[PDB]
Amino acid sequence: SNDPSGYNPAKNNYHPVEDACWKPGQKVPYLAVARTFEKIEEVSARLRMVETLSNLLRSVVALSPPDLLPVLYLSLNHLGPPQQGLALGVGDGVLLKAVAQATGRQLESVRAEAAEKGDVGLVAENSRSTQRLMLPPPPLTASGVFSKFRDIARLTGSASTAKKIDIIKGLFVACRHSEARFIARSLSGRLRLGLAEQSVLAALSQAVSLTPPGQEFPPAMVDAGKGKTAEARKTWLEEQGMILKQTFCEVPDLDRIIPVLLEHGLERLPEHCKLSPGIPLKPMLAHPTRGISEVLKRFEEAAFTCEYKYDGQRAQIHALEGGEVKIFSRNQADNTGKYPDIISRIPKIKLPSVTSFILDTEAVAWDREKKQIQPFQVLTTRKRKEVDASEIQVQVCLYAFDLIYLNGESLVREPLSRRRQLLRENFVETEGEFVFATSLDTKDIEQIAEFLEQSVKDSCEGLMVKTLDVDATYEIAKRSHNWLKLKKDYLDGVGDTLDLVVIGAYLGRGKRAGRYGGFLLASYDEDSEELQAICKLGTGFSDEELEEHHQSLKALVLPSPRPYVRIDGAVIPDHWLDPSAVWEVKCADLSLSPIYPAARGLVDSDKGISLRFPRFIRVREDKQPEQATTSAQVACLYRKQS
DNA sequence: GCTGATGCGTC
DNA sequence: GTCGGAC
DNA sequence: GTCCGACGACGCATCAGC
Ligand SMILES: *OP(=O)(O)OC[C@H]1O[C@@H](n2cnc3c(N)ncnc32)[C@H](O)[C@@H]1O
Ligand SMILES: [Mg+2]
Ligand SMILES: [Mg+2]
Ligand SMILES: [Mg+2]
Ligand SMILES: [Mg+2]
């Protein structure tokens, strides 16, 4: 109704009409979204973030229903449904170049300031635009910005980058107040509100519950909870929240959900949006566990099963009523074109009485000559888009462990004991092509230990543990991490541990802004008496330990690298460090690296060795660089993985 | 027609 | 993928 | 326990520059 600069979606007694900063039917100003982002990032309690976002959404619902879908995508920093594959194709380099041109500054200067500040958003908004005339263009709108993000993403092929930069410069030219900050963070893929998919869904269910869509204007019902006690209100909002969450888990597509929501309302939503083959769904996830004893603590007395945890890529296989077959990744991306070989074997895995299904499987590289699982790295050499069956060279075996839908029946609310039985009886195993995950039903600690040892001997990461009947459904909305993963490298006394030298530091971004966010590490090659970069490291240390690292490594900063340090193709550190600090580092496995020089020539002529899932464990004050893990030791640890 | 840098999606 | 912080 | 965003290696896919 006035100036969006003063918009406060965090105010007390927020009124969706009277406190909006735009008029009924008007397009939602982008500045309204930006001020909402400001108020969100100012707080740390999710519940406060959700109310703030809910207030904006209620104003959108009340005043400008068509902008709901854009505003939600801007809030998630998504371009659309994950199975459609839209991607910006920008990257820091392009974004920074656009900021340079827009502000008429040198690229190197913008790059150095972004790194120093740990944030592109502040650089893009604390500098004015040269192309801007005396008369600014019209103010940006939420849907307008979203459509421009989509335009950027749809630009492909030769000469597309320059067209992308033009759109980005136009946006920065039209920005006001804090707008440029959130445009830039969105384009860089680092919106970092502290609020994401789960909080957005909560704000959306809260908003449509309190301010129903479909009302004649002016809406008679602006706050549908005002007539309820505080406790009844909270119970009601939690129930409505679960209706939305469970539907979205089954159909994580806002293009489908939002129109239904505006037309029929939330309570009728499940009737219109149901789980079905051909629509990807959210997969069930797992929590790590320390050991067998913790497994018994979380599962108490409930019977459970242990399954090999195969080291491949999750594949959600959909067989539609009528024959069509789709395959999706754990992030709902369409991998159908990547697996022509699997699509052709579907008739061979399902009994003829199966008319439709959704299977939960692990695609694993398989050596047909040796009849043996192959490592995850081999699997990754497969082509991704538009693959022809004849050209496949790395074969895949599917390891199936769950069944989510069969013959028209959703199994989401059924216990695993029944889902597994339907999987085992209606599908056919073929060695090297499609098999059921090796499993063990027991409560005996001794058997479980031997079974965990055996899973590793059989080329697996460890064990997956799942209840059979108690809280054993596939309802992600109730618990997304219902399963437990047990790997050996989670244990304190098990796993490959290395002592590596810190040779560089990278300036932190976001939460790490103003300090180091990552470090470059090296092993010691005793033949050439050089330090060879082996991996980067950015997790495992607490906020306190990280502040100590910054204090302790600041005397070691060097203007130039030492001659006996070799990094080859690794990212050049922002700060070179005199080799001195030695840290203990844990990884899940060692891999052959196309960029790191550590141990190059000892296991492969061209490739050195790096670490899979590295994490900081502790400082090794009792170790000098000469006593750090050697490149020969690295090579020996890699060979031991057979 | 080719290549290095790098985006993007696996983990 | 692992991890720690805030709730 | 949930939710979130810091950060990791790696390989195919993509495109400015040649
Ligand atoms: O390490 P993480 O949390 O990503 O592990 C979960 C992934 O493990 C894969 N996987 C392999 N074998 C199984 C079984 N038997 N059951 C469940 N998941 C399994 C999946 O790809 C999963 O995302
Ligand atoms: Mg950097
Ligand atoms: Mg895995
Ligand atoms: Mg730690
Ligand atoms: Mg590129």
Author numbering: 260 to 901
Describing publication, verbatim:
Of the three human DNA ligases, LIG1 is established as the replicative ligase, completing ligation of the >50 million ligation events during DNA replication in addition to ligation events during DNA repair. Human DNA ligases utilize the energy of ATP and catalyze phosphodiester bond formation to seal breaks in the DNA backbone. X-ray crystal structures of the three human DNA ligases (LIG1, LIG3, and LIG4) in complex with DNA have revealed a conserved ligase three-domain core architecture that encircles the DNA nick, induces partial unwinding and alignment of the 3′- and 5′-DNA ends, and distorts the 3′-OH strand into a C3′-endo sugar conformation to adopt an A-form like geometry. Unexpectedly, we found a conserved Mg2+-binding site that forms a junction between DNA ligase domains and the 3′-strand of DNA.
To define the functional contribution of MgHiFi, we purified a double alanine mutant of LIG1 (LIG1E346A/E592A) that removes both of the protein ligands. As ablation of the MgHiFi site had significant impacts on substrate interactions, we examined the structural consequences of this mutation. Crystallographic isomorphism between the LIG1WT•DNA crystal structures enabled direct assessment of conformational changes in model-phased Fo (Mutant)-Fo (WT) electron density maps. Removal of the MgHiFi ligands led to the loss of bound metal ions at Sites 1 and 2 and concerted structural rearrangements of the DNA in the upstream (3′-OH side) of the bound nicked duplex. These rearrangements included 0.4–1.6 Å shifts of the upstream duplex, whereas the protein and downstream duplex remained largely static. The most significant motions are localized to 3′-terminal base pairs, -1 through -4, relative to the 3′-OH. Removal of MgHiFi causes rearrangements in protein–DNA van der Waals contacts proximal to the mutation, creating a cavity that allows for alternative conformations of the DNA backbone and dynamic binding of the phosphodiester backbone between the -1 and -2 nucleotides. Overall, mutation of the MgHiFi site has localized impacts on the trajectory of the upstream strand. Our X-ray structures of the E346 A/E592A mutant reveal a cavity that facilitates dynamic protein–DNA binding in the mutant ligase structure. We hypothesize that the impaired fidelity of the LIG1E346A/E592A enzyme results from relaxation of the strict geometric requirements for Mg2+ metal coordination during DNA binding, and creation of this cavity.
